[PDB]
Design a protein around this ligand. Structure first.
Ligand SMILES: [Zn+2]
Ligand SMILES: [Zn+2]
Ligand SMILES: [Zn+2]
Ligand SMILES: [Zn+2]
Ligand SMILES: [Zn+2]
Ligand SMILES: [Zn+2]
Lengths: 285, 59, 248, 105
């Protein structure tokens, strides 16, 4: 079925992500506002209209319900705002202004890792807002993460204490994979370089228990790659060109089982890709 | 019975497993079970086991 | 503003379990569309509702799972569940002495069957069926070197791959939680190998108990469930509005 | 409304305790509880964990309680635990064999 939602925004939409339970939808636009709808039973209830940003809001990311109703938003105004809902209302809860350029993407860490939000800014700085209770956040900034500027950040699923890894894609035409050391410092470990233009969105594939790590990354030119790592010990990623697009590709999103990829590009077209038995990704839409 | 006398499984999904079961029963001296299965199944597994081994089991 | 990326006007994202949140440039703001894609995924919410996992009885659970799969319309699932019904029979339990008989795991219809089915549904990326099989065939599992090797060889689930099976169960539990079946998620997660006197009845309380944070008087859970459905103060007469001051 | 000296006498406190003890033998626990409410009204003398199902920290308002089990130290929201214990008879936490509802009998 189709549940069409009228955003009622004052400008073009830049992202739209529903909650973990799939009941509440939060959208962001250039109108400096974030609207959280209630799309249960195909409804439209404007639960809140959060306006705390001085610039356009790029990406929103719900948190796991294990930590409560938490929404994160990154905006062009160098400002990261975390909205937590309490007593039936959505209100500003935490404020982050550690970046000197526009924060492009926010992606919450898996709930096993705790309550960690990774932000990527256009200045090449990556900040991880670890949460330690009592309503304070500690920031472990990864300075100079990318030469020109980080565009997207995606976390690696908890795989077996816990080794925390995430993928970053910047404007330096490359993908950087990060892991924290034993002390806590985050050190670059492997560099991925196959895109001929800006890496706009890197998205890890959620793990289902398979011994294979998959990364889908889109680029400014229009190249979408599938970075498979069949052997964890080898830690070698072999890119596979999913498709060559005539325009820019903006966002890539995996399924819950990581078998269907939602490739959305600048041509105002949304394509669903499923891997065939022959190893070639074929469009479904 | 379930495998043979039955958005579905591949048609020849269990052929390798049936051959392995036949060889497992034959290699431990239970040629009776292997021959009985071969006769009951007939052509469903006959084309998968080579003629020489089938003749050896039958004899 | 040279290094900032160009603003996105269209995007697609998988949200929830079987929903796709894609918005497009209008070509006055865009339009956000939520499309149900439960048919695209290899897992079924209805199957998750209908599957049961009773450790005590495995044949009954396999039979009900086959019936539910037929109700949904998965012929392969019906066949696999009937195969599990046959292959998880309690009369096939391995003996402690390796010299008595060949274990059913060494039989090609045992461990080899299970490995083939798991490989096929890993190719299909069916976390549901993978977790279901790895729980059904684990519930049945509930000189010295040879004995240890026989113990390792008498299990239809490979001991050297228990991490993968636990990952299957954890991923399916997360999927069930995403759907909203907390009871089903807790039921599935139980198969993972790696993990005061009542103020009303005045009987010692040792099982489930509710104790108010404000005052500290409580007891058996059912007793407070019955008592607070009508009254509002603490049953010991302390006057604490326990429902208002504890159910935060 | 007896005076403090009269109600503090050992004899009147003995009848009340005997009546309450007698009223427990009839399993009139709810009726006895109202007696203690009445007694405390006039007599001055009187007496963050996560839910195992929904993984949330601390009529139908009773369901927001936390049924802390004294044996396995596990618990959760009363609505979640009661729903889980309605069909099953084991602690929802994995690798726990306690029977939270069947233990008290
Ligand atoms: Zn009690
Ligand atoms: Zn009290
Ligand atoms: Zn109280
Ligand atoms: Zn317990
Ligand atoms: Zn709960
Ligand atoms: Zn207990």
């Amino acid at each position: 079925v189709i549940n069409t939602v009228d955003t009622s925004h004052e400008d073009m939409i830049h992202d739209a992500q529903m909650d973990y339970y799939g009941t509440r939808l939060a959208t962001c636009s250039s109108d400096r506002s974030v609207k959280i709808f209630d799309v249960r039973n195909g409804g439209q209830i404007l639960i809140a209209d959060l306006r705390g940003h001085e610039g356009p809001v790029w990406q929103v990311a719900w948190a796991h319900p294990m930590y409560g109703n938490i929404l994160a938003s990154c905006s062009y105004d160098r400002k990261v705002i975390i909205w937590r809902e309490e007593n039936g209302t959505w209100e500003k809860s935490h404020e982050h202004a550690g970046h000197d350029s526009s924060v492009n993407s926010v992606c919450w860490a898996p709930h096993d890792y705790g309550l960690i939000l990774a932000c990527g800014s256009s200045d090449g700085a990556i900040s991880l807002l670890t949460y330690t209770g009592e309503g304070q956040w500690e920031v472990k900034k990864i300075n100079n993460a990318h030469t020109i500027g980080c565009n997207a950040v995606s976390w690696a699923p908890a795989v077996v204490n816990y080794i925390k890894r995430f993928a970053s894609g910047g404007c330096d035409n490359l993908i950087k994979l990060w892991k924290e050391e034993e002390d806590g410092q985050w050190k670059e470990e492997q560099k991925l370089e196959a895109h001929s233009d800006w890496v706009r969105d890197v998205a890890w594939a959620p793990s289902i228990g398979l011994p294979t790590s998959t990364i889908a990354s889109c680029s400014q030119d229009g190249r979408v790659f599938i970075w498979t790592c069949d052997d964890a010990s080898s830690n070698t990623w072999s890119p596979k060109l999913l498709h060559k697009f005539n325009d820019v590709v903006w966002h890539v999103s995996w399924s819950i089982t990581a078998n269907i990829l939602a490739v959305s590009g600048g041509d105002n077209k949304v394509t669903l890709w499923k891997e065939s038995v022959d190893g070639q990704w074929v469009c479904i839409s | 019975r379930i495998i043979y006398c039955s958005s579905r499984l591949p048609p020849d999904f269990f052929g390798v497993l049936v051959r392995d079961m036949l060889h497992f029963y034959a290699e431990q001296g239970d040629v009776q079970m292997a021959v009985s299965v071969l006769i009951v199944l007939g052509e469903r597994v006959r084309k998968d086991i080579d003629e020489q081994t089938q003749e050896h089991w039958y004899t | 503003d040279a290094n900032i990326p160009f603003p996105r006007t269209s995007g697609a994202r998988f949200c929830g379990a079987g929903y796709l949140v894609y918005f497009t440039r209008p070509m006055a703001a865009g339009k956000v569309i939520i499309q149900d894609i439960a048919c695209l995924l290899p897992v079924h919410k209805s199957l998750g509702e209908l599957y049961i996992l009773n450790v005590n009885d495995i044949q009954e659970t396999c039979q009900k799972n086959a019936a539910s799969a037929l109700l949904v319309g998965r012929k392969d699932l019906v066949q696999v569940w009937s195969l599990a019904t046959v292959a998880t029979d309690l009369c096939l339990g391995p003996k402690s002495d390796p010299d008595l008989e060949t274990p059913w795991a060494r039989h090609p219809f045992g461990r080899q069957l299970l490995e083939s089915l798991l490989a096929h549904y890993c190719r299909l990326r069916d976390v549901q069926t993978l977790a279901m099989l790895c729980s059904v065939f684990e519930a049945q599992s509930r000189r010295e070197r040879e004995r240890d090797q026989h113990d390792k060889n008498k299990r239809l689930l490979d001991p050297a791959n228990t991490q993968q099976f636990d990952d299957f169960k954890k991923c399916y539990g997360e999927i069930l939680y995403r759907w909203g079946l907390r009871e089903k998620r807790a039921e599935v997660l139980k198969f993972v190998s790696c993990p005061f006197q009542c103020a009303i009845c005045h009987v010692a309380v040792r099982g489930s108990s509710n104790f108010c944070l404000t005052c500290g008087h409580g007891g058996h859970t059912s007793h407070m469930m019955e008592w607070f459905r009508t009254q509002e103060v603490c049953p010991t007469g302390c006057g604490c509005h326990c429902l208002l001051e504890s159910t935060f | 409304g007896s005076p403090l000296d009269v109600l503090k006498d050992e004899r009147v406190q003995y009848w009340i305790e005997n009546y309450r003890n007698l009223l427990d033998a009839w399993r009139f626990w709810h009726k006895r509880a109202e007696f203690d409410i009445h007694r405390s009204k006039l007599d001055p003398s009187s007496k963050l964990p996560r839910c195992a199902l929904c993984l949330i920290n601390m009529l139908a308002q009773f369901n927001n309680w936390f049924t802390w089990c004294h044996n396995c130290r596990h618990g959760g929201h009363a609505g979640h635990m009661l729903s889980w214990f309605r069909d099953h008879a084991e602690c929802p936490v994995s690798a726990c064999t306690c029977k939270c509802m069947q233990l008290d009998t």
